[PDB]
Amino acid sequence: AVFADLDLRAGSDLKALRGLVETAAHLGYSVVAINHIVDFKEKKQEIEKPVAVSELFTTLPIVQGKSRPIKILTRLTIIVSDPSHCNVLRATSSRARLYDVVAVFPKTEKLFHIACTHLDVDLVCITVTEKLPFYFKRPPINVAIDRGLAFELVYSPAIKDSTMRRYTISSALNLMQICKGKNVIISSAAERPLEIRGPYDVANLGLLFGLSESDAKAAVSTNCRAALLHGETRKTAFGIISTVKKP
């Protein structure tokens, strides 16, 4: 029953980051998750100290609700088109062990097949910009919903154009018609310093997609916590949690 969990694609500078954190803490949010877009052309890996939130923010974000300390997550969104770049991401399962939730973005149907079949990821990114048609096979979706794969739908087409709005709503209606709507969570991107709307109306932005009259909000509020759970069971251990506790 953990609400207020979305995925943000936002890094420009510290000032815009502080503004987005203050805006999210003001409106309705209690967990901020920052994505980092990495494409297949650059192939860069800077994982050790790239962001450093706690050394630069001031000790607490204050919200209007229960006034609880906001947990801040650092996630990685990897755009993967080539199959060799997917093999590079296969090589990163033992070399560098950070970035609690690993989010792959597929473009090839064979690569999307082996992503749901063999490749150990947390949440598959599905965004459609500038004419990307894609078919859906149902038994890997069944293995995905049996495993725990929550499908990410990162949306921000309303700010730039309207054709991008059309392709996103068409791909989302196709996803809701084929995937049947078991675990699909939607999230907003942040390039401009104000690209966030109300938290209760994200439920209707998912209800325009479909998925239920109420289990859209119930499914995002359950499956984002289940996504943090899946990332934690990938990070710590698959059945064990070992934490150093020195009182």
């Binding site: 990938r234 059945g239 064990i240 150093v244």
Partner: peptide, 28 residues
Amino acid sequence: FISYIYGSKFQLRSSERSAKKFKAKGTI
């Protein structure tokens, strides 16, 4: 140290645990 152990997949004649067949399936 303090360790949390989810006793869901830990089952089936636990000599099988040290032997073989522990894969990554399911969250609790």
